[PDB]
């Protein structure tokens, strides 16, 4: 969960700040090792979450939900075209998938640079969030590929059903 | 050592419980009124002078052993206390000199 990930990250960050105050040796090296470990853990979590979202379209795994869809009819001038646009339904599904993925992949970045100072804020992907983890998925690109394939399959099925239902514009147009 | 043919460096002052036995024997002989090897008595007096320093050296050896054991335990953080390890190594080198 997003709140649980945020709480764990905040605890890790408070511990890191305390360690920086502790005046140990090799603080940057330790920060790098901790960041790499956090990256591996987040990657395992992200692969699991992508798989779970794909299944939901079809415990550390997680289980997101789904919204509704734009399905309707009209005869406004006698054009039976489903509302909103089928592109609208595809955009809604893609946005939901992006939000579910970003719920995990958009957790706060490692605050190991709190001990660092001298330059401006470096909030890139891994600077602000854990940006690189989406490419750091341990399962590989197969999970994101499965998500995209599921989106494409749902869209294709929706288009097929919509076409089958909407073949009858000629009845009102003849 | 047992399992390690490398020389396990038990560096310390040239001391043992025999010095404490000599100091106690000198005290007992002084209390009870006996003759003794007065050169050995002077050596025992010097040992009694140096005894607190020997105790400090033994305590330092014990502390260094404890630090080594802590490093062996938390090898997962062994780089994190590298500064303390380097400071201890430098101090130990100065003492060995």
């Amino acid at each position: 969960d997003h709140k649980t990930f945020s709480e764990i990250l905040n605890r890790v960050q408070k511990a890191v700040d305390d360690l920086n105050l502790h005046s140990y040796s090799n603080l940057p090296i330790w920060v790098n090792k901790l960041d790499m470990e956090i990256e591996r853990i987040l990657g395992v979590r992200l692969q699991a979450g992508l798989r779970a979202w794909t299944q939901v379209l079809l415990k550390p795994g997680g289980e997101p939900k789904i919204k509704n869809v734009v399905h309707e009819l009209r005869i406004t001038n006698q054009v039976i075209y489903l509302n909103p646009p089928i592109e609208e339904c595809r955009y809604k599904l893609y946005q939901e998938m992006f939000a579910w993925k970003m719920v995990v992949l958009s957790l706060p970045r490692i605050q190991s640079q709190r001990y660092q100072v001298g330059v401006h804020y470096e909030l890139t992907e891994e600077e602000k969030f854990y940006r690189n983890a989406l490419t750091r998925m341990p399962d590989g690109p197969v999970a994101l590929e499965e998500s995209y394939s599921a989106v494409m399959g749902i869209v294709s099925e929706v288009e097929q059903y919509v076409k089958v239902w909407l073949q009858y514009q000629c009845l009102w147009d003849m | 050592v047992r399992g390690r043919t490398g020389n396990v460096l038990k560096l310390k002052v040239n001391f043992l419980p025999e010095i404490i036995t000599l100091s106690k024997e000198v005290r007992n002989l002084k209390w009870l009124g006996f003759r003794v090897p007065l050169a050995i008595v002077n050596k025992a007096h010097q040992a009694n002078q140096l005894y607190p320093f020997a105790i400090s050296l033994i305590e330092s050896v014990r502390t260094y052993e404890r630090t080594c054991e802590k490093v062996e335990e938390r090898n997962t953080i062994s780089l994190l206390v590298a500064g303390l390890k380097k400071e201890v190594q430098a101090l130990i080198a100065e003492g060995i000199a």
Binding site: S25, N26, L27, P28, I29, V119 | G6, N7, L9, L11, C68, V71, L79, A82, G83, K85, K86, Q89, I92, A93, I96, A97
Partner: peptide
């Protein structure tokens, strides 16, 4: 911005400290 390169804080190994000590003991 000179990324990292913070001298790679490290120290001599305990076996390395013992080996340098053995060399000093030969030199002692």
């Amino acid at each position: 911005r000179k990324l990292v390169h913070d001298k790679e804080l490290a120290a001599e190994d305990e076996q390395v400290f013992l080996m340098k000590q053995q060399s000093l003991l030969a030199k002692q």
